[PDB]
């Protein structure tokens, strides 16, 4: 058994680690200049590979979250601080040629404010939403954030239209990808291929549905962490997308008022004609067929003859109640109690929406942004790919399953696209015995 | 407006093959260790490039201290100790991949490194200067 | 000299390249806003030198500066006769006559390096 050892080099050995990403390819989503490249990263398919994956463990989601918060902070630096706004507001109601359902929203208020001269004042009046002003004690009301953190403005030269982003890996490392189209979030995958960069990812923000997202390969699938638990959000991924119109029928104006040395402010002008109500409109029967396919997959894991039902929202905060989205560079909050009203045993739909101006953040009370009122008429068409579901408990003899909306944090939204990828550290070195021997 | 004309092996294509057969694609990995370039973003670019430099220099130093530097695969004079595995020479080369062998021996690494360093120093260099004089 | 063999024929500047080689064996020897640039400059220098040393070290040519190998030269890349090349052409002209087939030449050198030199060496080691 005269045996000696070889020392090989460049053997294909995997490990696991956490590392730093790598971007690829006036707006402040990406850059004007991220990395120029040969933008066709060729997929490389393997042989005889079975690899364990995992979900709800992704470092990449956390890196994406930190990077997007960092870029969003990078945006709001050079703009204008809005400190002289916390004043008293003498107000009056809006009357002229108004639809009676829109009574209460708009308010005509006026106040005093300084100009670029530090020695005089002026008289400034504009138009505000109901959901942004709060009563102090005619209608002497104060601004909704003046009890708390200060208020800023966004610079008007920057749009909010998202652009796809390709992540890539640094050298010495690699990314893998599951070719099995029937992969629930955890467990092994039997068909693995590698890429040097990923597909395009649109960082799109919404609460309850999913917009402009990816499809599924085959059918409707259902993703959650612990389905035996009732304290887990459930991911929905459709097979066929559904169109949606959402638009602002009103027709907008905007003034521009100097407030300080090198500082100006954007106030709202007047509106031609009527005062209407923004809303959304979808199909009807495709919704019914979609929920039929959903409950077909739902009976595969719960009691099939257990009653499958939908509830409304269970209340709580205004944020997770409505449906946030960003059509036209503006933020719409939609009263969506209509779509979740059905029971199940074993063409146009109207949904009114509301708009805010002072916009919190992901989950921070340290900032406040005031978007300028966009002049004109805004229309938006988008797709719908996914949904977010919750579930109660109390297993009282397996009856009456009722579901509700959800969708708190955006990390679930960024696992919705990133449910496949995994990062691998490469070990080139390695040894093995042999029958040879070094010679003098 | 392109076509595809594949000739050579894939990057890590041979990973699902057997060790004694997949030993012949070792070039491609070292061919593809230090490329990919071929505000905050440039910061992490330089971060990544520095990390790649550090790992490559680490492994070349580990090559250089041994007497198996510069070239590819080589030999030595350390006889095998059977306290680590006890196969009969066909089950490894014809019946085992690389991830399997890596999970078999991932506790004995540092001892093998140290003993190769020991035999590389001892009776090779002082012995050389013994042979460099009558 | 530092790049002294510029306006010469390849066959003409074929003997005194060793003095060029010793003179090109230097660069780090004989030693805020701007410091960021200095750091990036050092990074670029390190990356280029390591690129060159890697590409030397993969082949069998990583010792001396000229060497031989086991690849027959294919006539699909060029077609010029030997004296025509060595006595009537500079380096830059040869560069523009070869700078499309370079990667294939690299890959053929790589496969010639791996095959029939190490596993063949491994079979030669067994007595």
């Amino acid at each position, epitope marked *: 058994e005269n045996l000696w050892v070889t020392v090989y080099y460049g053997v294909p050995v995997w490990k696991d680690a956490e590392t730093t990403l790598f971007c690829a390819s006036h707006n402040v989503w990406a850059t004007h200049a991220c990395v120029p490249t040969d933008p066709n990263p060729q997929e490389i398919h393997l042989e005889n590979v079975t690899e364990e994956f995992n979900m709800w463990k992704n470092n990449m989601v956390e890196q994406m979250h930190t990077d997007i918060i960092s870029l969003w902070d990078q945006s709001l630096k050079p703009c204008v601080k809005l400190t002289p706004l916390c004043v008293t507001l003498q107000c009056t109601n809006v009357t002229n040629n108004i639809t009676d359902d829109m009574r209460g929203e708009l308010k005509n208020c006026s106040f005093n404010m300084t100009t670029e001269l530090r020695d005089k004042k002026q008289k400034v009046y504009s138009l505000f939403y109901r959901l942004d002003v709060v009563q102090i004690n005619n209608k002497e009301y104060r601004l909704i954030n003046c009890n708390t953190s200060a208020i800023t403005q966004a610079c008007p030269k920057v749009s909010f239209e998202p652009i796809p982003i390709h992540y890539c890996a640094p050298a010495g490392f690699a990314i893998l990808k599951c070719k099995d189209k029937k992969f629930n979030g955890t467990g092994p995958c039997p068909s693995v291929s590698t890429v040097q960069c990923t597909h395009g990812i649109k960082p799109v923000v919404s609460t309850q549905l999913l917009l402009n997202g990816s499809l599924a390969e085959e059918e409707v699938m259902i993703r959650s962490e612990n389905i035996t638990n009732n304290a887990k959000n459930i991911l929905v991924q459709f097979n066929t997308p559904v169109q949606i119109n959402c638009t602002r029928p009103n027709n907008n104006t905007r003034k521009s008022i100097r407030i300080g040395p090198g500082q100006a402010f954007y106030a709202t002008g007047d509106i031609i004609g009527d005062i209407r109500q923004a809303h959304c409109t979808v199909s009807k029967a495709t919704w019914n067929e979609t929920l039929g396919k959903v409950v077909k997959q739902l009976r595969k894991h719960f009691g099939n003859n257990t009653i499958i039902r939908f509830a409304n929202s269970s209340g709580g905060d205004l944020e997770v109640t409505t449906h946030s989205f960003n059509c036209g560079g503006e933020f719409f909050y939609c009263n969506t109690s209509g779509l979740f009203n059905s029971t199940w045993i074993s063409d146009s739909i109207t949904l009114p929406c509301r708009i805010k101006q002072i916009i919190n953040m992901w989950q921070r009370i340290g900032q406040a942004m005031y978007a300028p009122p966009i002049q004109g008429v805004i229309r938006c068409v988008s797709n719908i790919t996914g949904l977010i579901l919750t579930r109660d408990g109390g297993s009282t003899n397996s009856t009456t399953e009722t579901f509700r909306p959800g969708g708190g944090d955006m990390r679930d939204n960024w696992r919705s696209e990133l449910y496949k990828y995994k990062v691998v550290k490469i070990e080139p070195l390695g040894v093995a015995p042999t029958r040879a021997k070094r010679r003098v | *407006a392109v076509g595809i004309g594949a000739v050579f092996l894939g990057f890590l294509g041979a990973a699902g093959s057997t060790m004694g057969a997949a030993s012949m694609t070792l070039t491609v990995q070292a061919r*593809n260790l230090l490329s990919g370039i071929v505000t905050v973003w440039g910061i992490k670019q330089l971060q990544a490039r520095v990390l790649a430099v550090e790992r490559y220099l680490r492994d070349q130093q580990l090559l250089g201290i041994w007497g198996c530097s510069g070239k590819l695969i080589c030999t030595t004079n350390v006889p095998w100790n059977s306290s680590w595995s006890n196969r009969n020479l066909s089950e490894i080369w014809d019946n085992m991949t690389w991830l399997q062998w890596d999970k078999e021996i991932s506790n004995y690494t540092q001892i093998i490194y140290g003993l190769l360093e020991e035999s590389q120093n001892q009776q090779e260099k002082n012995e050389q200067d013994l042979l460099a004089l009558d | 000299g530092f790049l002294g063999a510029a306006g010469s024929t390849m066959g003409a500047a074929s003997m005194t390249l060793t003095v060029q080689a010793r003179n090109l064996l230097s660069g780090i020897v004989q030693q805020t806003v701007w410091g960021i640039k200095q750091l990036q400059a050092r990074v670029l220098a390190v990356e280029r030198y390591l690129r060159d040393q890697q590409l030397l070290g993969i082949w069998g040519c990583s010792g001396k500066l000229i060497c031989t190998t086991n690849v027959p030269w294919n006539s699909s890349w060029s077609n010029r006769n030997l004296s025509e090349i060595w006595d009537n052409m500079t380096w830059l002209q040869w560069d523009k006559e070869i700078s499309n087939y370079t990667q294939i030449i690299y*890959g053929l050198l790589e496969e010639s390096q791996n095959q029939q030199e190490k596993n063949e060496q491994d079979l030669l080691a067994l007595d």
Partner: antibody
């Protein structure tokens, strides 16, 4: 420059022919060639295209399973074959040339895969027409 | 990948500028750094002749009335000094991906 489109005729369904196309006044080993199609009283349609060095070939969405095209670099002469015909395949068949001079292939050092590059055309000849009849 | 002509056809008169569009269905920004839109014209009973390549770059040996325009959203054309020799069919052509596609048809004539 000289470029002819020979080969008119008339056939019933179920035949097999051979087509020719004579070139001149360019270094034929460098260029790619196409095959376009013009229905009577209609617009245009792309069919097929051969590579520069006569090793890669693509077809339209229709005749994948019918046609065959080949290049003779020695005679500077194109040979086309159309088999198992249909009467509704009657159109104008022309033999035209890409404008831009392509070059050598590219070999990436990432899993090889030799790539080619194409672009559109500049020169059309006169033309020909075979009416597949009954 | 599909592509449409915009508009269909038009009868024109001399002493007038011209502009003919061709709406895309994608954006074809090549990795070489441009977009693959070519124009070429034919005449009845005759062969086509190349109009303009490189989006905005007149072909060799062409009068100065012919240039190109547009980016990956949609494209146009640019012809001044309408003359009776400038009649026939004008086609826009994709040369990015297989299979290729073509412009439909632009009937161009004088006015009676």
């Amino acid at each position: 420059v000289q470029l002819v489109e020979s080969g008119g005729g008339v056939v019933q369904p179920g035949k097999s022919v051979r087509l020719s196309c004579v070139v001149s006044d360019f270094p034929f080993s460098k260029y790619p060639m196409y095959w376009v199609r013009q229905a009577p009283g209609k617009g245009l349609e792309w069919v097929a295209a051969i590579s520069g060095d006569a090793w890669h070939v693509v077809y339209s969405n229709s005749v994948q399973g019918r046609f065959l095209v080949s290049r003779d670099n020695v005679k500077n002469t194109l040979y086309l074959e159309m088999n198992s015909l249909k009467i509704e395949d009657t159109a104008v068949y022309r033999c035209a040339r890409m404008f831009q001079e392509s070059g050598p292939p590219r070999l990436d050092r990432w899993s090889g895969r030799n790539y080619y590059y194409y672009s559109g055309m500049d020169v059309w000849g006169q033309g020909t027409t075979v009416t597949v009849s009954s | 990948i599909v592509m449409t002509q915009t508009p269909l056809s038009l009868s024109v008169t001399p002493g007038q500028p011209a502009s003919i569009s061709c709406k895309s269905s994608e954006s074809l920004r090549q990795s070489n750094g441009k977009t693959s839109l070519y124009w070429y014209r034919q005449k009845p009973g005759q062969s086509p002749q190349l109009l303009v390549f490189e989006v905005s770059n007149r072909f060799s040996g062409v009068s100065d009335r012919f240039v190109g325009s547009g980016s990956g959203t949609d494209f146009t054309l640019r012809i001044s000094r309408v003359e009776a020799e400038d009649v026939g069919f004008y086609y826009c052509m994709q040369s990015k991906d297989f299979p290729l596609t073509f412009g439909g048809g632009t009937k161009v004539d004088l006015k009676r």
